[PDB]
UniProtKB/Swiss-Prot annotation:
Record function comment: Histone demethylase that specifically demethylates 'Lys-9' of histone H3, thereby playing a central role in histone code. Does not demethylate histone H3 'Lys-4', H3 'Lys-27', H3 'Lys-36' nor H4 'Lys-20'. Demethylates both di- and trimethylated H3 'Lys-9' residue, while it has no activity on monomethylated residues. Demethylation of Lys residue generates formaldehyde and succinate.
Catalytic activity: N(6),N(6),N(6)-trimethyl-L-lysyl(9)-[histone H3] + 2 2-oxoglutarate + 2 O2 = N(6)-methyl-L-lysyl(9)-[histone H3] + 2 formaldehyde + 2 succinate + 2 CO2
UniProtKB keywords: ADP-ribosylation, Chromatin regulator, Dioxygenase, Iron, Metal-binding, Nucleus, Oxidoreductase, Transcription, Transcription regulation, Ubl conjugation, Zinc
Gene name tied to this protein: KDM4D
Keyword Ubl conjugation set for record: yes
Protein known as: Lysine-specific demethylase 4D
Length: 331
């Protein structure tokens, strides 16, 4: 069995290997990349996402989210407080202000220490989940707005035609902005490209060990767990690497830099934080290997998780027994 210790693998495809996205995902899995839950893909030196980032300041962040924490430094939840709209230019200025800018630090490890020590005492503002793309239409390779859709994959594998569309999302980040522990909707893959700016640190649990994370989370967030049997779908809970080590949960960590792709694999729990002002783009996708994960994915039916239009058909076709309860949670 390839990659039996579930280490995060890093790939350096040639320009030729960068042509066929599906084939390269399948190649990565042949080498055991999916066992980690997360892989890094460094694009060939010939490739570019677009010509420059000089003209992005007028993009609107309609609902910036202030991420307010509660709990202790290693074990906390966050809620999202809606702020007034601002442009990417206004946001970048705010990120770089004394109140929100990255502190002086020696290296990524020092910054990680500072994040886990001090995150709870600040409430950074995140521009998340903005529908859109920064890939040039003329970028033909690994263009996140031109991937095959999850609806077409399900149709190709299973023969059922379904409604729904699948488009990318932009994330504008600042120091301490945080993504809580989660797997993707319906345990899909995700792909994330860091277009510009400061890094993003990721933590990941191997898919084969996801249930160990869930058990710990139920222990650490006992009221949340009573409220919903899939409360990690709410995307609000954080657990530090120190706490995971203390409880024997297998995980790995890696820092993504501008110009790099990360791929999360089905049922790979991940979490992380941004180092400073940045812009990422991400989208879900599927492969044939996903179908079995989709069929077994947990669902939140308590009402909190509320998700896209397009998840309806996935639940309806893959999880017909669950569909009625899940939809009640939607309404
Ligand atoms: O970049 C972020 O804030 C969150 N991204 C993801 O969880 C992802 O790409 O799967
Ligand atoms: Mg603009
Ligand atoms: Ni994700
Ligand atoms: Zn729930």
């Amino acid at each position: 069995a390839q990659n039996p210790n579930c280490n995060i693998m890093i790939f350096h495809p040639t320009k030729e290997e960068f042509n066929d996205f599906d084939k390269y995902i399948a190649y990565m899995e042949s080498q055991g990349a999916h066992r980690a839950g997360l892989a890094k893909i460094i694009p060939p030196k010939e490739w570019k996402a677009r010509e420059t980032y000089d003209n992005i300041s007028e993009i609107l962040i309609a609902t910036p989210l202030q991420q307010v924490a509660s709990g202790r430094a290693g074990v906390f939840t966050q809620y999202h407080k809606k702020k007034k709209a601002m442009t990417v230019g206004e946001y970048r200025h705010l990120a770089n202000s004394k109140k929100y800018q990255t502190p002086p630090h020696q290296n990524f490890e020092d910054l990680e220490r500072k994040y886990w020590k001090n995150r709870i005492y600040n409430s950074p503002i995140y521009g998340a989940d903005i529908s859109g793309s920064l890939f040039d239409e003329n970028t033909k390779q690994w263009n996140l707005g031109h991937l095959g859709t999850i609806q077409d994959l399900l149709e190709k594998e299973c023969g059922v035609v379904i409604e729904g569309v699948n488009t990318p999302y932009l994330y504008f980040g600042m120091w301490k902005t945080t993504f809580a522990w989660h797997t993707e909707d319906m345990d899909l893959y995700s792909i994330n490209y860091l277009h510009l700016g400061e890094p993003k640190t990721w933590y990941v649990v191997p898919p084969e060990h996801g249930q160990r994370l869930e058990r710990l989370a139920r222990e650490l967030f006992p009221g949340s767990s009573r409220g919903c049997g899939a409360f990690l779908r709410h995307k609000v809970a954080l657990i530090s690497p120190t706490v995971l080590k203390e409880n024997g949960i297998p995980f790995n960590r890696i820092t993504q830099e501008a110009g790099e792709f990360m791929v999360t694999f089905p049922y790979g729990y991940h979490a992380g934080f941004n180092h400073g002002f940045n812009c990422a783009e991400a989208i879900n996708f599927a492969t044939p290997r996903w179908i079995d994960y989709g069929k077994m994915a947990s669902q939140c039916s308590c009402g909190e998780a509320r998700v896209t239009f397009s998840m309806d058909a996935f639940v309806r076709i893959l999880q017909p027994e669950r569909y009625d309860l899940w939809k009640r949670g939607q309404d």
